[PDB]
Amino acid sequence: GSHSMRYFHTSVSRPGRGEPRFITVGYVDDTLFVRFDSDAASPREEPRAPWIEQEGPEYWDRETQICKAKAQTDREDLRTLLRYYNQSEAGSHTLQNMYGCDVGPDGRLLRGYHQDAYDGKDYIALNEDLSSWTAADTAAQITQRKWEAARVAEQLRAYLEGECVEWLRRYLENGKETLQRADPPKTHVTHHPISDHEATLRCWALGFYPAEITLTWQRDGEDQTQDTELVETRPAGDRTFQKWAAVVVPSGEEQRYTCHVQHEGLPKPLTLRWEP
């Protein structure tokens, strides 16, 4: 199907406690495959998936250099943004950056990304055209004017259309055993009495990959959206994910409730009911 590659970066200044911490992680779809942490003992880009380990030493050297260099430019930008926002040097601040590409089933570029946040708020973002910018405020407009003069968007467009897509295709082939395998959820429905009049029906989805999934409860075929407790999809820790949906049901009405499971690893969307 469709696939994605993303690089995530966070710098967090810590005045009086050394230089800003820099952590960056790379993903293909929902699979972590590289990491760099400026606080590690001998900081290097490290593999986090088996299909990336075969890349040779010059790969790891180039990725290490880029990460270290991005750590340095974030530290300069943190100082710059203190000026742009008229802020004291005493507080901790955060810079986040994500970039990457989505490709369709044929491997062609669907769209690229490159966007920033300062202290958790949108700062500047490359638009879907990969040629213009959206700046969130007059400070980010200063960066916008800098980046337009240095023609940053052209370099990004060349990367996102070229290397991003091509290396994603390479990774997808090398890790096809896992990256191109969908693991359907194992599903069941539990029943948890609350009082003489009420019980909780909880619909479980376990062990699935990728993370995208739909769990819904229906009552007499009508979606219980407002009365359904839906936990955030969560990592099991073994590459797979978990989720549940729950409704509080009048005792005796259990059979009017159906749980519906959509997942790309399922040929047909599933329907299941509480089975006493």
């Binding site: 990460c67 960066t143 800098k146």
Partner: peptide, 9 residues
């Protein structure tokens, strides 16, 4: 693999 250019803000 990563983007190599290093624009400053």
């Amino acid at each position: 693999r990563r983007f190599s250019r290093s624009p400053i803000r």
